[PDB]
């Protein structure tokens, strides 16, 4: 009623407004940072998967348990990516319920997630899934790349056949304006749109090269999501 | 008019926000209140159920506020079922006149107080989740709401 | 003047791309280099320091590296690594620092995989101060 | 004139500035300087009661953040800096009585000033 | 009583803000003046906190908008411990009346200028980051606040 | 103001900003508006101008946020030539002035409706692009603009 109210009300929103204004440019220019590392690891996305793709054409017509599915779908892993900080929007928001679908519609109803942030930790919690390890306020200084020492659990897991399938939710940064959400599978190998005719010779054979490339692959997979 | 408030039994208040909004009748469902909204003379129901979405409505009031500055997709998920409800109710509130047929170009419709305690109960329970907010302007019953939703699908 | 384009890449950046009329890596088995015109090729890379000799020897840059493949692409020639430095850059005093004061640590850890990773790092420390000295 | 001129719109740019303050790990390197120099020209611009400053006393209080000689110094003793300063200004070099006198700026004394202000950092806590 | 202030020495404005929170004696500390707060009068350990004070809690005031809004969570690791620090010394400037005993239901208690300073630099000096917030409300000295967090 | 307001015809708003910035006579040109700013009053040439030169000065003063912390390099490739523009013309507006003759030395400087328009009309056209700003600088007709970038 009174304009004492109203006086007050326009000083809390102004410096709100001071802040939410502050945070646009501050995340302008971070978006814009890490748009850069993502890109930056292309050329060696590129020159791991011209390897790979050459094993798939190769090993096409006989198939490879991570070309095509094992059979087995005896257990199944997942990681998920969320932020530290809120503030978002509806992006943590999507993420969480994208999962949620994939969790639900298994045949298998045994599942392990894997969460970075604390938007997921927290989410894990409440909804009730097997209880793994996380990693949170993560360091973007010590490089994300060395944070991605998961690569090696998941990869001796499959050795073990404690794991026959591996999934990941993370938010793919298209442009500046809108990013696309995505739900990508890591361990069952995406075989190539189009077929390698390119002719390779291995020192160690075929058999070494794959089993050295695999770990290298999860831990560039992840680090670029 | 704060003098003629204490002569009178029951109270209609009607707000230029709901009006402004797009809303006839521009009732304030908060600020009307009546005398005679008690147990003893409306029953259980009735007095039940117009308690309910005051309460609903004075939730959806206290939010509008915090919605207005970020947004829908910061307020919690409890909270976002009980808006997502409020102003279907809110919008439910609405309905052609007789009057103003000439006006608004629709056949007023006369709802009895049976079945507009149906209505709200209904919504309230969240069984109307599933119809859109725009399937509930100047409607009148129920039943006729959802009819406006299939119109729609057509 | 008979050259070739290499380059060399890791998960974060790429780092170079010269021409480049020999180069030398280290594999597990033994010792590699490269000349022009080599027919198609990939294998793995032991921890080893590798150097870059630029058509009728302008200069030879040396480098380190700690694990990777080598890549022949009719024509061009990449080199994937996990961990790349130049041999300037490590300086014995910053790594000798870590050796001994990760040593007293290995004995306190009880874990037998904790210690292969302890076991696998100091394989890398003495590899940069090996390929510093020769 | 020469040191207080453009410090007051400098000041109110920094005042501008102060928002993103909180954001300062990822905020450029230009524009974190300016902070810096920001917080050290607002404790020289606070002063104690009944101790006012001479005119002389002021211009070399404002030289030396203008110019940027507070900048590698911390912020919590840019206070305690100018006190000791204008002790050891005073006693030793004499050059309080010399901007007092000719009440300007000249090159050869600018140049003067800078070698004991060096002097005095140097010797500094 | 825009008229009477100027003919007071020292002034003990009582804010409801801070008597709605329910913390008494409600005591607005950046409104609250005295002609004797100088170096002269108090020496230099009291004068220096007392401002120190003071500067805290002028920051959580301007702080105090963010939270409401955007949150706790939305706020620099830097101001997060000048948030909590300014709430505990905020609700530790409550102690119980003696006259106070029939509202309160505390025997009350009488702190010399001493036991107060030490109390209050103790805080700023961060050593009670561990206690509580809640264990600052109606009591004594510095003491019993830091006995209250384990005693319950 | 109010009933001021009714008599009005134009206004000419002088901002501080701009004054400071280093740019006389300053007068804000989205604050300053006109009732004769219309194709009935002046003409269509000199009306699409106006409203051209406007829309890219404020397009400026959005992108102003950026340029301010991040900087002229960290910005859309697409903007930086319109923004490029907007800077030149924003110096263009400056005018060396006859009463200012005492004080900065330099003769003053009328210019005319019909100078002004080809001069506005050409650096969003894309002419003289190739000229560098601070020819722009107390400057009278385009045609010493481009003279002043090879005295420079």
Redesign the interface.
């Given at each position: 009623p009174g304009m004492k109210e109203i006086k007050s009300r326009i000083?809390?929103?102004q410096?709100?407004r001071?802040?939410?204004?502050?945070?646009?440019?501050?995340s302008?220019?971070?978006f814009?940072?890490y748009s850069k590392?993502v890109t930056?690891?292309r050329?060696?996305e590129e020159?791991?998967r011209?390897?790979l793709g050459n094993i798939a054409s190769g090993v096409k017509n006989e198939g490879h348990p991570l070309f095509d599915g094992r059979k087995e779908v005896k257990s199944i892993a997942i990681i998920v990516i969320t932020s530290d900080?809120?503030?978002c929007?509806?992006f943590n928001?999507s993420t969480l319920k994208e999962l949620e679908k994939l969790v639900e519609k298994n045949k298998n109803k045994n599942i392990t997630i894997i969460p970075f942030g604390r938007k997921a930790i927290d989410f894990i919690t409440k909804r009730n899934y097997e209880f793994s390890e996380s990693f949170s306020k993560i360091s973007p200084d010590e490089?994300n790349?060395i944070a991605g020492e998961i690569s090696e659990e998941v990869v001796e897991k499959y050795n073990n056949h404690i794991y026959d399938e591996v999934y990941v939710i993370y938010n793919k940064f298209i442009s500046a304006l809108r990013y696309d959400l995505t739900c990508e599978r890591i361990i069952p190998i995406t075989r190539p749109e189009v077929e390698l005719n390119?002719?390779?010779?291995?020192?160690?054979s075929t058999e070494?090269?794959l089993s050295?490339?695999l770990p290298?692959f999860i831990?560039?997979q992840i680090?670029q999501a | 008019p704060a003098t003629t408030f204490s002569h009178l039994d029951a109270t209609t208040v009607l707000s230029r926000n709901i009006a402004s909004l797009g809303i006839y009748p521009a009732v304030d469902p908060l600020d009307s209140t009546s005398k005679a909204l008690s147990e003893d003379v409306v029953g259980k129901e009735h007095y039940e159920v117009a308690r309910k979405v005051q309460e609903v409505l004075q939730r959806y009031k206290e939010l509008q506020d915090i919605i207005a500055?970020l947004?829908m997709?910061?307020l919690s998920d409890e909270d976002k079922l009980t808006v997502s409800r409020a102003r279907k109710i809110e919008r439910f509130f609405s309905q052609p006149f007789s009057v103003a047929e000439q006006f608004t170009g629709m056949e007023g419709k006369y709802v009895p107080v049976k079945e507009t305690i149906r209505g709200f109960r209904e919504i309230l329970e969240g069984k109307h989740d599933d119809i859109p907010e725009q399937a509930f302007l100047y409607v009148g019953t129920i039943e006729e709401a959802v009819a406006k939703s299939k119109d729609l699908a057509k | 003047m008979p050259s070739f384009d290499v380059?060399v890449?890791?998960?974060?950046?790429?780092i170079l791309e010269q021409e480049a009329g020999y180069l030398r890596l280290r594999?597990?088995?033994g010792d590699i280099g490269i000349l022009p015109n080599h027919?198609?090729?990939?294998?793995?890379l032991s921890m080893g320091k590798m150097e870059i000799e630029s058509p009728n020897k302008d200069r030879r840059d040396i480098y380190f590296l700690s694990g990777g493949?080598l890549?022949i692409?009719?024509n061009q020639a990449?080199v994937?690594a996990?961990e790349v430095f130049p041999i300037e850059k490590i300086d014995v005093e910053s790594e000798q620092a870590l050796v001994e004061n990760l040593k007293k640590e290995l004995e306190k850890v009880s874990t037998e995989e904790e210690k292969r990773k302890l076991q696998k790092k100091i394989k890398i420390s003495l590899a940069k101060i090996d390929a510093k000295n020769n | 004139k020469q040191v207080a001129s453009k410090v007051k719109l400098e000041l109110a740019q920094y005042t501008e500035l102060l928002?993103?303050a909180?954001?300062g790990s990822?905020?450029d390197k230009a524009t974190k300087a300016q902070l810096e120099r920001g917080h050290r020209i607002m404790e020289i611009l606070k002063q104690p009661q009944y101790h006012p400053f001479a005119v002389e006393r002021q211009v070399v209080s404002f030289y030396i953040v203008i110019n940027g000689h507070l900048d590698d110094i911390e912020v919590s003793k840019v206070r305690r800096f100018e006190k000791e300063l204008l002790d050891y200004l005073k006693a030793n070099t004499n050059i309080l009585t010399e901007i007092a006198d000719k009440k300007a700026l000249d090159k050869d004394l600018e140049e003067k000033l800078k070698e004991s202000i060096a002097n005095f950092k140097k010797s500094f806590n």
């Open positions: 000083k809390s929103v410096s709100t001071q802040i939410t204004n502050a945070m646009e440019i501050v302008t220019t971070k814009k940072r590392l930056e690891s050329p060696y020159s791991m011209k390897i900080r809120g503030l929007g509806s928001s490089m790349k390119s002719e390779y010779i291995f020192e160690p070494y090269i050295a490339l290298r831990n560039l680090y | 500055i947004g997709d910061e | 380059s890449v890791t998960q974060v950046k790429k594999t597990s088995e027919a198609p090729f990939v294998a793995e493949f890549e692409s009719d990449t994937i996990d | 928002t993103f909180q954001f990822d905020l």
